[PDB]
């Protein structure tokens, strides 16, 4: 029966634990692995918007998410001299409305894992080799131990090792949006209280906020550049590039960058999307950022993780575990919605900033209203199957 189908789910992010939840509810027996020792606390703030709030409510986690939600009371668009151009209440500022909610990644993953407490999960574990034939997926773990599974679902993130192990370069594109993102935590030296400030120039944006930790602030940097690093994973090159890019910005960036050396969560990356004609090969499926990452400029990644998890599990349910049928349906039903959400990110990468002009109240307000409306349009733009 479907209960006896062996399914390996790789990574304890959003998509992995969510697809594990739905597979179990739908009569399958998934197991999870995670390379890290434990769920990473804190991290980036994730949005649940549009159709994804329905899925969260059905999973029984929506109230728990709302209990752990981000608490920004107001955001402000400020000029480099600290004048307020435009102020919005926190949810509106974040382009959320209605039942939509924002939660730090680590707090969401904790809730997801509490909802699957019955599902076996092994941390400090990773797959170093995958081979498949018509009957089985043979997995080799890091220590050489081998196990066979009927299916493997890889939720291992935008940099996914499984994608590289399974697919060739002809089978996916890494779409570079021409921009970089960086974030790090510093002492809250301004004494912000549940508030975010956002300052921009033609090609760059800087945010500073304090929310759940009164003595900490999170800094963020997004900027368009055609520069390529010698080694994009070299952290000292990243910090020199960030510093050089922002040396002339003004506002709080000297105060922020002067505290960068002592921050312990530093994050830097190119803004990239994953475009695949097929997320699946044989008995192996990619899901979440590994398959379809829309990039942070979209603000939809978490939504795509939730929707992908629901659809892949439900199509396996409706196929009674026939993965050839279900994987085809997974690809066909979800690609347009993924493409819409990725193209929203592309749009942000191209039109959010004012190329030739200085921001004003009128521009920030009209832009904010437009994004709110476009995101509501794109985030509701799938007719979600009903699998029960
Ligand atoms: C700067 C930034 C800002 C963002 N802002 C937003 C936003 O405003 N709204 C929004 O909705 N989304 C946002 N996101 C996106 C959100 O973080 C992702 O879309 C979401 O986390 C997708 O989850 P996932 O489960 O696909 O992957 P992830 O959450 O990345 O989890 C993948 C997991 O797999 C593990 N793993 C990796 N490799 C292996 C391996 N080889 N073996 C085993 N385990 C492995 C990882 O440690 C990790 O726990 C942002 C992301 C970033 C980086």
């Amino acid at each position: 029966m479907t209960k006896h189908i062996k399914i390996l789910v790789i990574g304890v992010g959003v998509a992995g634990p969510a697809v594990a939840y739905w597979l179990k509810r739908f009569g399958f027996s998934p197991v999870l692995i995670e390379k890290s020792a434990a769920v990473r606390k804190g991290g980036q703030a994730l949005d649940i918007r549009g159709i994804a709030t329905h899925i969260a409510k059905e999973m029984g986690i929506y109230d728990q998410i709302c209990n752990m939600r981000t608490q920004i009371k107001c955001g402000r668009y400020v000029d480099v001299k600290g004048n307020v151009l435009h102020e919005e209440q926190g949810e509106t500022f974040g382009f959320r409305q209605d039942d939509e909610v924002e939660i730090l990644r680590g707090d969401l993953v904790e809730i997801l894992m509490k909802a699957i407490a019955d599902i076996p999960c092994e941390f400090k574990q990773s797959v170093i080799k995958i081979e498949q034939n018509e009957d089985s997926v043979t997995v080799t773990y890091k220590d050489g131990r081998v196990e066979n599974y009927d299916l493997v679902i890889a939720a291992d993130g935008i940099h996914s090792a499984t994608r590289g192990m399974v697919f060739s370069k002809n089978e996916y594109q890494l779409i570079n949006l021409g921009s970089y993102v960086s974030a790090f935590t510093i002492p809250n030296y301004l004494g912000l209280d549940h508030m975010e400030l956002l300052c921009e120039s033609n090609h760059k944006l800087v945010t500073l906020q304090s929310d759940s930790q009164a003595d900490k602030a999170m800094a963020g940097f997004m900027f368009r550049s055609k520069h390529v690093l010698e080694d994009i994973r070299d952290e000292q090159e990243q910090k020199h590039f960030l510093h050089a890019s922002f040396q002339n910005f003004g506002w709080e960036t000297q105060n922020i960058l002067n505290r960068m050396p002592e921050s312990d969560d530093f994050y830097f990356d190119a803004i990239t999307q994953i475009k695949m004609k097929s997320w699946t090969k044989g008995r192996i499926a990619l899901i979440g950022d590994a398959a379809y990452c829309p990039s942070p400029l979209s603000g939809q990644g978490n939504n795509l993780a939730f929707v992908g998890a629901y659809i892949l599990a439900g199509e396996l349910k409706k196929a009674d575990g026939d993965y050839i049928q279900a994987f085809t349906r997974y690809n066909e039903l979800l690609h347009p919605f993924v493409e819409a959400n990725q193209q929203f990110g592309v749009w942000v990468s191209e039109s959010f900033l004012l190329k030739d002009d200085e921001v004003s109240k009128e521009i920030a307000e009209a832009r904010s209203n437009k994004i709110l409306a476009m995101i509501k349009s794109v985030s509701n733009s799938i007719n979600l199957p009903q699998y029960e």
Side-chain angles (χ1 to χ4, degrees):
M1 198 50 178
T2 59
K3 277 278 184 62
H4 301 315
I5 298 174
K6 284 189 69 182
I7 305 179
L8 174 63
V9 183
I10 306 176
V12 171
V14 179
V19 79
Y21 171 86
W22 281 106
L23 286 168
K24 185 75 174 297
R25 171 163 164 165
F26 289 167
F28 304 88
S29 301
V31 303
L32 280 160
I33 65 172
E34 166 59 50
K35 197 182 59 176
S36 287
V39 172
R40 296 186 178 186
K41 305 194 189 303
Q44 61 271 40
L46 308 192
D47 300 288
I48 299 169
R49 296 199 184 85
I51 63 189
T53 67
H54 178 84
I55 298 173
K57 292 178 181 177
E58 289 203 336
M59 293 168 77
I61 63 175
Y62 178 76
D63 290 339
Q64 295 159 257
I65 292 174
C66 288
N67 180 247
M68 296 298 292
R69 76 191 298 157
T70 62
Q71 291 178 327
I72 300 295
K73 296 182 224 304
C74 103
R76 291 169 174 180
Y77 295 86
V78 300
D79 69 20
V80 293
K81 298 267 185 65
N83 304 305
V84 173
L85 312 175
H86 183 53
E87 175 177 304
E88 298 169 327
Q89 303 168 331
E91 296 296 296
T92 301
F93 186 73
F95 315 115
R96 296 187 297 282
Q97 58 191 303
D98 298 320
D99 61 340
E100 299 178 334
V101 55
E102 183 187 55
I103 179 168
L104 299 185
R105 176 183 176 286
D107 297 331
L108 176 54
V109 172
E110 182 173 343
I111 292 166
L112 289 169
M113 290 304 288
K114 279 161 183 170
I116 56 166
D118 47 333
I119 297 181
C121 188
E122 190 181 352
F123 292 80
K124 295 296 302 193
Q125 183 58 291
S126 58
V127 170
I128 58 176
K129 192 164 88 167
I130 306 173
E131 294 193 297
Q132 67 174 316
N133 61 19
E134 286 181 20
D135 307 335
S136 186
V137 186
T138 308
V139 159
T140 306
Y141 293 107
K142 187 200 294 194
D143 66 351
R145 291 179 179 178
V146 172
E147 188 163 4
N148 284 265
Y149 293 87
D150 291 283
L151 305 169
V152 176
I153 298 167
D156 54 357
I158 186 183
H159 294 312
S160 163
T162 307
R163 186 182 61 233
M165 287 188 271
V166 173
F167 297 86
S168 77
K169 298 293 264 192
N170 302 326
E171 300 179 310
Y172 62 96
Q173 308 173 45
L174 309 173
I175 293 177
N176 190 314
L177 298 192
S179 46
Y180 292 97
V181 59
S182 186
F184 47 95
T185 299
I186 58 177
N188 180 21
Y189 66 94
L190 296 175
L192 296 170
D193 172 26
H194 297 289
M195 179 177 285
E196 178 170 353
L197 308 177
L198 185 163
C199 194
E200 57 198 286
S201 65
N202 293 136
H203 303 294
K204 306 160 179 155
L205 171 151
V206 182
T207 59
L208 185 65
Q209 68 160 69
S210 175
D211 185 20
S212 78
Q213 291 169 289
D215 70 353
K216 304 302 190 187
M218 167 73 80
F221 295 81
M222 289 191 276
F223 56 114
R224 290 199 52 83
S225 174
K226 300 200 179 200
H227 185 248
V228 187
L229 282 76
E230 301 170 10
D231 176 10
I232 192 164
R233 295 176 292 273
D234 178 346
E235 171 167 308
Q236 285 313 129
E237 196 186 353
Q238 295 168 354
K239 292 185 172 172
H240 285 214
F241 178 54
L242 189 67
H243 195 298
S245 294
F246 284 87
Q247 65 181 287
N248 62 327
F249 186 92
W251 186 57
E252 289 296 332
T253 61
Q254 282 160 342
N255 288 332
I256 292 165
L257 294 168
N258 284 344
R259 294 165 166 88
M260 180 170 67
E262 297 290 315
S263 45
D264 315 314
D265 53 351
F266 180 83
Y267 166 84
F268 184 102
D269 210 357
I271 293 162
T272 301
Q273 306 181 321
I274 305 293
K275 188 156 189 298
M276 311 185 63
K277 184 165 172 278
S278 182
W279 302 312
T280 65
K281 183 180 295 302
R283 290 172 173 275
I284 302 169
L286 304 180
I287 192 160
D289 281 358
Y292 44 68
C293 182
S295 89
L297 295 180
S298 83
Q300 312 303 314
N302 186 64
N303 261 32
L304 297 184
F306 272 84
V307 172
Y310 183 68
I311 289 183
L312 178 54
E315 293 306 317
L316 281 159
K317 174 184 184 195
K318 294 296 175 177
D320 295 340
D322 177 328
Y323 66 89
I324 297 167
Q325 164 167 326
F327 287 1
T328 292
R329 293 277 282 172
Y330 170 55
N331 278 293
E332 289 171 338
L333 290 168
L334 189 53
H335 263 84
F337 183 67
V338 158
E339 286 154 12
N341 283 277
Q342 293 184 320
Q343 176 53 30
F344 178 71
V346 174
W347 180 86
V348 168
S349 78
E350 301 173 331
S351 48
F352 185 86
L353 309 167
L354 286 56
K355 190 168 61 177
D356 306 329
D357 301 315
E358 294 293 320
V359 302
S360 63
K361 174 157 180 85
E362 281 170 348
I363 300 302
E365 183 168 21
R367 183 180 57 194
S368 172
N369 289 341
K370 181 177 197 177
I371 287 170
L372 183 66
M374 295 174 63
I375 284 179
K376 203 186 183 175
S377 187
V378 75
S379 77
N380 288 293
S381 67
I382 181 164
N383 187 331
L384 197 71
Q386 293 173 232
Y387 293 115
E388 288 165 323

